[PDB]
Curated annotation (Swiss-Prot), chains A, B:
The record marks 2-3 as: Cleavage. The chain holds residues 24 to 91 of 91 of the full protein. Disulfide bonds join 10-34, 11-50. The modification Methionine sulfoxide is found at residue 67. It comes from Homo sapiens (Human). The gene is CCL5. Changing residue 26 to A: No effect on inhibition of activity by tick evasin-4. This is C-C motif chemokine 5. It comes from the Eukaryota. Changing residue 32 to A/K: No effect on inhibition of activity by tick evasin-4. Changing residue 23 to A: No effect on inhibition of activity by tick evasin-4. The lineage of its organism: Eukaryota, Metazoa, Chordata, Craniata, Vertebrata. Glycans are attached at residues 4-5.
């Protein structure tokens, strides 16, 4: 191993309500050292949220962020 | 469950070298949704590090932080 001496962002919950696209700084996926793979929406307040890719608005932000 | 819709800080690595007590803002333990329970030293740069309680300097910071 290289040097993964840091905590791992593992999200297991899934907020049913969507978040404000005006406060979603950046998100990212998480898995491997987690019970299940899920998305993580981080706002500008360093607030990490858990979102499942099986929603209709979750993949909406992931698609609006990773544009072409 | 209440509302744990956030990522979980799970540390599995253990830095062999100690950290600078002049940059250790605050630390905390982590477990439950993690493969193993470990400590987490967070500096002022929002840098989360993993430290095991089986070291000689790790419990040193945890004891110097949770004074009486």
């Amino acid at each position: 191993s290289p040097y993964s001496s840091d905590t791992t962002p593992c999200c297991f919950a899934y907020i049913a309500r969507p978040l404000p696209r005006a406060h979603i700084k950046e998100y990212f996926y998480t898995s491997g050292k987690c019970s299940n793979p899920a998305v993580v929406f981080v706002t500008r307040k360093n607030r990490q949220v858990c979102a499942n890719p099986e929603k209709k608005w979750v993949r909406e932000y992931i698609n609006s962020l990773e544009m072409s």
